[PDB]
Amino acid sequence: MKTPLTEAVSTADSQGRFLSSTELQIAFGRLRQANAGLQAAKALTDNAQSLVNGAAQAVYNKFPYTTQTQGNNFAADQRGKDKCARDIGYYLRIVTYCLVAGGTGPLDEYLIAGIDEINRTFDLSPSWYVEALKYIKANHGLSGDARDEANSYLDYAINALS
Amino acid sequence: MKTPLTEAVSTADSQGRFLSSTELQIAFGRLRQANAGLQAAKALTDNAQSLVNGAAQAVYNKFPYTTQTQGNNFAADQRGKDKCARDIGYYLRIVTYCLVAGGTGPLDEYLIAGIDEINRTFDLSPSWYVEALKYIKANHGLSGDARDEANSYLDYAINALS
Amino acid sequence: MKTPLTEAVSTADSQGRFLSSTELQIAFGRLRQANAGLQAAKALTDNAQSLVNGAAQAVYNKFPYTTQTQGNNFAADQRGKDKCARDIGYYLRIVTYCLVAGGTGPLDEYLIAGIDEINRTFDLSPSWYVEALKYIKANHGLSGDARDEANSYLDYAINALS
Amino acid sequence: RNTASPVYAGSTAESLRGTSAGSRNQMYRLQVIQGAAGTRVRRGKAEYLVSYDNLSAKLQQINRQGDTVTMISLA
Amino acid sequence: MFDVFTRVVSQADARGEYLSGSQLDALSATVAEGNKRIDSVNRITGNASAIVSNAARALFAEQPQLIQPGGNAYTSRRMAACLRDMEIILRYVTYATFTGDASVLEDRCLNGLRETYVALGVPGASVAAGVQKMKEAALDIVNDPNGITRGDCSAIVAEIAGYFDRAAAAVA
Amino acid sequence: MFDVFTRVVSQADARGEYLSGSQLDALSATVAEGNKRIDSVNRITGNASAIVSNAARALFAEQPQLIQPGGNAYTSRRMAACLRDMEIILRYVTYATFTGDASVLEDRCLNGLRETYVALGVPGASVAAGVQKMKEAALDIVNDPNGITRGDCSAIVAEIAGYFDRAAAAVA
Amino acid sequence: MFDVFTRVVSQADARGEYLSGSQLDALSATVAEGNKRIDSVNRITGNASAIVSNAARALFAEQPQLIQPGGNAYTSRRMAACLRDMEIILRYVTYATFTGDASVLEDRCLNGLRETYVALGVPGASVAAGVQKMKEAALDIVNDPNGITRGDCSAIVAEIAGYFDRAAAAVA
Amino acid sequence: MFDVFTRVVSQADARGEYLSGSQLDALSATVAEGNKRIDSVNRITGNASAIVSNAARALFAEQPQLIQPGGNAYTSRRMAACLRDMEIILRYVTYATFTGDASVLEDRCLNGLRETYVALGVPGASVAAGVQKMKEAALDIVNDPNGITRGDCSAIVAEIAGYFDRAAAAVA
Amino acid sequence: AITTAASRLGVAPYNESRPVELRPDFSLDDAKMVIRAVYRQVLGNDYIMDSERLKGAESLLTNGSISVREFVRTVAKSELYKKKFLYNNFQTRVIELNYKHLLGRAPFSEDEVIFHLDLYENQGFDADIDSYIDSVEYQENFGENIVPYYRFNNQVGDRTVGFTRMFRLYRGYANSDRSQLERSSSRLATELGQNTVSAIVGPSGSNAGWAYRPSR
Ligand SMILES: *[C@@H](C)[C@H]1/C(=C/c2[nH]c(/C=C3N=C(/C=C4\NC(=O)C(CC)=C4C)C(C)=C\3CCC(=O)O)c(CCC(=O)O)c2C)NC(=O)[C@@H]1C
Ligand SMILES: *[C@@H](C)[C@H]1/C(=C/c2[nH]c(/C=C3N=C(/C=C4\NC(=O)C(CC)=C4C)C(C)=C\3CCC(=O)O)c(CCC(=O)O)c2C)NC(=O)[C@@H]1C
Ligand SMILES: *[C@@H](C)[C@H]1/C(=C/c2[nH]c(/C=C3N=C(/C=C4\NC(=O)C(CC)=C4C)C(C)=C\3CCC(=O)O)c(CCC(=O)O)c2C)NC(=O)[C@@H]1C
Ligand SMILES: *[C@H](C)[C@H]1/C(=C/c2[nH]c(/C=C3N=C(/C=C4\NC(=O)C(CC)=C4C)C(C)=C\3CCC(=O)O)c(CCC(=O)O)c2C)NC(=O)[C@@H]1C
Ligand SMILES: *[C@H](C)[C@H]1/C(=C/c2[nH]c(/C=C3N=C(/C=C4\NC(=O)C(CC)=C4C)C(C)=C\3CCC(=O)O)c(CCC(=O)O)c2C)NC(=O)[C@@H]1C
Ligand SMILES: *[C@H](C)[C@H]1/C(=C/c2[nH]c(/C=C3N=C(/C=C4\NC(=O)C(CC)=C4C)C(C)=C\3CCC(=O)O)c(CCC(=O)O)c2C)NC(=O)[C@@H]1C
Ligand SMILES: *[C@H](C)[C@H]1/C(=C/c2[nH]c(/C=C3N=C(/C=C4\NC(=O)C(CC)=C4C)C(C)=C\3CCC(=O)O)c(CCC(=O)O)c2C)NC(=O)[C@@H]1C
Ligand SMILES: *[C@H](C)[C@H]1/C(=C/c2[nH]c(/C=C3N=C(/C=C4\NC(=O)C(CC)=C4C)C(C)=C\3CCC(=O)O)c(CCC(=O)O)c2C)NC(=O)[C@@H]1C
Ligand SMILES: *[C@H](C)[C@H]1/C(=C/c2[nH]c(/C=C3N=C(/C=C4\NC(=O)C(CC)=C4C)C(C)=C\3CCC(=O)O)c(CCC(=O)O)c2C)NC(=O)[C@@H]1C
Ligand SMILES: *[C@H](C)[C@H]1/C(=C/c2[nH]c(/C=C3N=C(/C=C4\NC(=O)C(CC)=C4C)C(C)=C\3CCC(=O)O)c(CCC(=O)O)c2C)NC(=O)[C@@H]1C
Ligand SMILES: *[C@H](C)[C@H]1/C(=C/c2[nH]c(/C=C3N=C(/C=C4\NC(=O)C(CC)=C4C)C(C)=C\3CCC(=O)O)c(CCC(=O)O)c2C)NC(=O)[C@@H]1C
Ligand SMILES: *[C@H](C)[C@H]1/C(=C/c2[nH]c(/C=C3N=C(/C=C4\NC(=O)C(CC)=C4C)C(C)=C\3CCC(=O)O)c(CCC(=O)O)c2C)NC(=O)[C@@H]1C
Ligand SMILES: *[C@H](C)[C@H]1/C(=C/c2[nH]c(/C=C3N=C(/C=C4\NC(=O)C(CC)=C4C)C(C)=C\3CCC(=O)O)c(CCC(=O)O)c2C)NC(=O)[C@@H]1C
């Protein structure tokens, strides 16, 4: 999956080469980033319940028909509400993995690949999840490099949905 | 060329992806290195004639037959000595390019690719150039990251010749 | 374009073969069907405006937020309503082409190929058009072979959207 | 033979590279006259776009088949 | 490729228009000619080998320079390629007759063919003469009134003759 | 392809010269701008979908002929291709911004693009208008003072503008 | 392949859990060792040719039966393959050190190597002897206190020794 | 791949026999049921998306272990692959209904499928349950008395049930 | 050919298929069939997600900017291919997969492993991929404009060991190279080294003993 260390070795392996100063520079870039990523992962994890619940409610407010309309794809009943909070939790959890790994790899492998087919098949609007991701962006309270990297994955997911 | 920035974009383009946090971290790694690399290039450039002349004499000292044996491939005459000093200058100049570019790309593109055919065709011993590179390593007077990056390229050339 | 005559020749051409009894039977199948398709196309064409306006109102009735919510992707203004009526008109018109052609080729080439990217890019919900297509099925008034073929294309579009 | 040839003057020689143009990101357009002396030949005149890395291999391929090279230019 | 139906559809889509009643009526008339169309395809196909071989023999009889040593049809490989070309052209003419549209013949067979022949020294005018001989035999086979429901196939025969004429014009 | 560093190297190698002190100093200045460059790449990428979609909507609003039946952006496939092209050009512009050199954009994306569009009948002037719309949106996003360490980004914004202008000129 | 970070991530996802505080702290500890890890990779790579050649020369000296006529390393082709294999194993050892995870070494290098050597008659025990020789040379190079910031590299050295041990065990 | 007609032909050829009068009459009865067969194929195809999605929803509701973290249908990629599998099996079942012979299912859909699921760890028993759910929905759709010329479709329905049972048995 | 055992061996669907050729002045549907055929063949019938598609390469193929062979080369050099088949495999397994994907046959001899292992180690993966596609064998079978396909039937230049080893690499129609019982292990490392073959075991579904695999 796409992370700086994996990409570096993947490039050298493709070329049949030992690692060179180029790959070492990649590792230095990872080390400069890693601690901020781990801090962001911890902050999101400690706040996960609040972010997921607030994110779900933000979606319901923006799309009130989702809590008023009968259907398996909507959150009018507790069943659909539980499914919705589960899904938003998956986004938040996998985003923390990206922060730990230092790349979109976890999002690419676990969430984004095939997401279009899932949303089409089960009649789920990508706009719902875009709204949830925007809520998490505006409410995770991170700053500095932690904010920048975290928002990059949240926007990466948003762009994949749009 | 093989440099962190071009390689990062090349791999992203192969996947049709926008650049992500992984590639941004590659850039940060490059930025951490570049000033030391540029300083290393300046120091080698300012000392180039001393290093090149010293390296050529070191080869002649270690391989005295090169200055005493008649032949197109040897340095018994001024013609061969000039060819030799020119070649050692090429190694040093292209090594400074690697420091500027932050990768082995200039060495690969300009010198290393095809060096075996040249050395075989013109009966030039790789051991001669290994000794010259060893001299430059031992006499460039760099320290810290400048030393580490410069020696990585000098070792890269030595390994290619062995 | 997938139609019985084009696929018969293309398969024969891929085999480097003259047409044989197999392909002639394909032609007879088309001839058994063709008049029903043409009459179905005529009936839908004559009733096009009533079907399109009725379909659009069916969508607005089923998804009232589309006519209440501001946004470029919604029909809260005449701009959005005109876009929506236009889109539903495209679905109906291209369906009549399928009846004329005797296959889904017109739908595949003009409408379905790339529709997922468009709806994702412009935040258009496939469920809206599914509802529009369902209204057309329920109200075109066809019978017999004309009904069966027309509904196959309308269901083909619905399946493509789901 | 009272025939014409395609016009590849100015920028009309250019072709898209993308990620398919090899290490140098350069495309070479080989116009050849070919016949069936293997896969079926569909046209007596053909054009091939190959990267620099594969240009040598392509020439031997054309050479092995006995086909004639009429023009080569950068694309 | 297009068939007789998709050709009308493509033009209508580019104008953003439903097919008019007249256009639908014209296609209904095409449907009414379907059995005659299918019979014509079947009759040419059933006689394809005779059509090609008889035309080739007649062609080489009238143009002995093709098969004399050094001639473009001399040697087994070139003769075989020549007979193949005749069979190819006849095949795509039947394709066009089957679909009711010349696009398959033009796109897959005739486009580039004159350039191929000029490039390789194939005499296109001789190819055209061979196509004309195939045209004559094929139309006679189609028009044979024996063993078939009697009716007027002049429109279909005219259409088939046009495809042969385009093939003859394309190579010459 | 070149980056900002290897561009100077290649010019120096062809002359057989070490980089001058002025050239090294210029690269040192480029390194000092690296964080601004990374932020600009991140900001454009983080808004890629909105930039493409908003510009595409504005283009079709100002050029309704593109989307009318028969228009070059009519039908789902052609619209999907058009939106894909806008994203591709944006992606390669961000590549050039990342490397600091137009080679990746020129060598991989723009070379031969005009001929592709001329052959297809894609209106190049409309593509350039689309690229222009993406440019103004992208530069505003890059220039947004909120949520970022404040400083002067005029140099990188000018560089990004040049890359967009190159793309518009290549296709117009 | 996995790196040190993605190995923990993949395990966490299968359990559907956020990384625990201890897990994040453990990875933070790994980050603090990153400079030493990079230096160890750089030092092995910079001496790769000497490590392989010196190990190979030592191996053939203790095991002259490898290079006698008919021996498994006899003939230029087989000797070149032998030197190549030593370089391959060293290369993937440095990869695993770089990533902090043995997966790349297992997946690319060691998975199937024993089956290959057994099928061909390559003495796996002698390969393992060569790998051990590269190990002693490589660890000595990593531990050299000259020309580097002083500190404790025992943990990194132990990990590298483990990868060499894994390579030797895979073939012996 | 055989159809209902070529299945009998292949058995006859292996015996070197003409089809008997009984065999020809049996095929005549198959032709008499052809309209029912085409209708059943059309009805299943026209509801394919609903059959897949409804069956998938029911399977995951009764087997929540499939979709929890670590489950074989967890993550979008595995989930999408799972939905593709259901659609593919349904698609081939319609092929078998169309041809009147199970060979297309055996030759293509179920050929190597058990190896695929064992290798990947896909729970074959759960696939069988999903196939059973699609079967229940499909047969109801085929049997719907509304909007169709009334008649007895028990024979075709029994045949379709068998193809579903074949697929379910092949995986578990 | 293969007639009686075709269905049993999983060959019948390929008996019923024809080579996918991109003719000059190809239509839109022609290009789509090539892209589908290339993805199924070169990526070993693995499911391809929309996010994994090589949209740029598909565009150039559709435009005539790259031929079928160059499209095949682009797919084979992509990160998608390397992720699926390079980064997690022994190079002998990689060589096996390359032969099946790009040449539609199994390796014949240890010499092929020697050639491609050295070529990868000395020049890299991209250089090795070029060797398959620019080979005389690729030229004679597929040329510029035909998608690679499995060569089950006997051809000039064949060896009998190739036939038996095809069913070591091909495990049925409803199957992918990454979803077989041996998983990542090289199928032919032992067979090539000892110049031995094994009794053909047909795919599951049509063969009860489909799962037989020998031990170490
Ligand atoms: C065991 C491996 C030996 C050892 C290592 C060690 N290194 C550091 C610190 C640094 N090493 C580097 C490395 C590089 N700088 C470059 O520019 C490049 C070339 C691309 C490399 C490889 C760096 C950047 C640092 C940090 C800054 C510094 O100059 O110190 C340490 C100190 C602790 C730390 O983790 O930073 C150590 C211990 N030291 C030994 O004594 C072992 C023989
Ligand atoms: C069990 C399957 C159900 C059922 C079927 C049934 N159908 C017919 C007759 C016909 N059905 C068709 C079908 C089509 N006509 C078209 O143009 C197309 C679209 C391409 C289709 C699918 C046709 C042509 C006929 C014949 C004419 C007619 O309309 O009747 C029957 C009657 C018996 C017969 O075989 O002809 C039956 C029984 N009927 C049921 O009650 C089941 C729910
Ligand atoms: C000009 C082409 C000649 C001609 C043709 C002609 N044919 C018909 C009618 C039919 N021909 C067929 C054909 C076939 N039935 C089969 O089973 C096969 C094998 C696949 C074939 C080729 C059919 C089905 C018909 C309809 C029934 C019938 O036999 O009449 C006509 C009559 C008009 C019509 O369009 O049906 C005609 C005119 N007749 C000539 O005199 C020309 C020499
Ligand atoms: C919340 C914003 C809205 C909502 C949600 C909702 N989702 C489903 C069903 C599914 N959700 C997913 C998504 C994922 N599965 C994964 O494994 C991952 C990646 C790790 C993701 C993102 C899937 C695959 C499904 C289908 C299978 C399942 O049910 O688990 C439903 C139910 C749909 C149905 O028809 O059963 C709902 C309700 N709905 C709303 O209205 C909210 C605004
Ligand atoms: C330019 C258009 C705008 C602007 C940019 C700007 N940025 C900085 C400084 C930093 N920006 C970063 C960026 C990141 N940190 C991360 O971890 C990541 C995610 C992977 C990114 C993208 C960093 C590391 C710095 C340095 C630390 C700092 O915050 O100061 C500056 C300040 C000067 C500098 O170049 O460092 C500026 C000017 N500022 C504007 O006002 C423009 C709108
Ligand atoms: C109607 C059910 C709902 C609705 C419609 C709506 N659509 C758009 C914009 C577009 N619609 C299409 C669709 C097509 N274009 C084609 O060429 C074809 C194939 C022949 C189709 C089906 C496209 C491509 C667009 C985008 C470009 C364009 O504007 O034409 C809009 C506007 C979206 C925007 O952001 O401008 C709207 C409003 N919206 C509803 O709320 C209805 C329920
Ligand atoms: C002689 C043993 C018997 C015989 C011969 C016969 N041959 C033809 C016609 C042709 N013969 C050839 C052969 C070749 N043409 C070449 O260029 C070469 C290779 C250098 C060869 C071997 C060909 C191609 C033809 C057909 C075209 C042509 O006429 O030139 C005929 C006439 C056949 C016809 O239908 O006109 C005959 C009579 N016939 C016998 O009965 C002899 C026992
Ligand atoms: C016969 C009446 C005349 C004749 C023919 C002749 N043609 C060729 C060579 C070619 N003919 C074609 C044409 C096609 N190939 C196709 O695949 C299709 C489309 C499906 C067509 C229309 C081509 C492409 C060639 C060249 C490649 C090939 O030979 O297969 C030859 C041989 C030329 C040579 O010297 O090799 C000949 C002899 N020649 C005559 O003299 C007759 C007038
Ligand atoms: C959108 C603003 C405008 C528009 C675009 C449009 N483009 C095409 C077709 C192609 N576009 C490309 C371009 C690229 N492909 C690549 O891989 C890259 C990077 C190297 C680029 C820049 C290509 C190659 C094609 C042709 C093949 C393909 O279809 O993908 C179309 C379709 C043309 C047609 O008739 O099929 C369209 C619509 N059209 C407008 O009207 C806008 C102004
Ligand atoms: C003699 C002209 C000069 C010389 C020779 C020398 N050679 C080696 C070591 C090796 N020689 C070979 C060569 C071959 N091995 C083969 O199997 C074949 C093909 C059948 C050949 C040609 C090899 C492979 C080696 C290395 C392994 C081994 O020792 O067997 C040495 C020792 C090198 C070392 O580092 O041990 C020497 C001394 N040396 C001179 O000075 C002469 C001018
Ligand atoms: C050297 C210390 C010992 C030795 C080695 C030796 N190996 C071979 C042959 C092969 N080696 C490999 C290895 C790899 N392939 C891979 O994919 C990987 C990871 C990337 C590895 C490590 C393979 C597959 C072969 C077979 C192909 C080839 O011959 O290159 C030989 C040649 C054996 C023969 O030719 O029969 C040799 C000599 N031999 C010794 O005696 C040393 C102990
Ligand atoms: C869904 C109900 C269940 C499920 C399914 C599942 N399947 C796979 C992977 C594959 N499925 C197939 C099957 C086919 N491919 C074909 O081409 C054909 C028709 C000829 C068939 C029947 C194949 C070959 C694969 C592997 C290829 C690939 O790319 O996946 C997966 C993915 C497993 C993984 O690890 O990715 C899944 C999830 N899983 C469940 O839990 C349900 C019971
Ligand atoms: C004839 C005396 C007997 C006989 C033969 C028979 N063989 C096959 C099929 C194949 N034969 C081979 C053998 C080879 N292929 C090679 O490349 C070589 C070495 C260069 C050999 C020896 C192969 C591989 C096949 C299968 C592939 C193919 O045929 O192309 C058949 C047909 C089998 C079938 O159709 O299923 C037959 C009939 N059969 C007898 O009964 C005779 C005793």
Author numbering:
A (entry chain W), B (entry chain O), C (entry chain Q): 1 to 162
D (entry chain c): 196 to 232, 236 to 273
E (entry chain R), F (entry chain P), G (entry chain X), H (entry chain V): 1 to 172
I (entry chain b): 2 to 217
What does the paper behind this entry write?
Here, we take advantage of the latest cryo-EM developments to determine the structure of the quenched PBS bound to OCP to a resolution of 2.1 Å in the core and 1.8 Å in the rods, with some regions reaching 1.6-Å resolution. High-resolution details were readily visible in several parts of the map, for example, in the rods, where characteristic holes in the density of aromatic residues became apparent. Therefore, to explore to which extent resolution detail can be improved, we took advantage of the local D3 symmetry within the central Cpc(αβ)6 double hexamer of the rod (“central rod disk”) to improve the signal-to-noise ratio. The same particles yielded a resolution of 1.8 Å when not applying any symmetry (C1).
Cyanobacteria use large antenna complexes called phycobilisomes (PBSs) for light harvesting. However, intense light triggers non-photochemical quenching, where the orange carotenoid protein (OCP) binds to PBS, dissipating excess energy as heat. In these massive macromolecular assemblies, light-absorbing phycocyanobilin (PCB) pigments are covalently bound to phycobiliproteins that are tethered together by linker proteins and organized into the PBS rods and core cylinders. Using cryo–electron microscopy, we unveiled the OCP-PBS complex structure at 1.6- to 2.1-angstrom resolution, showcasing its inherent flexibility.
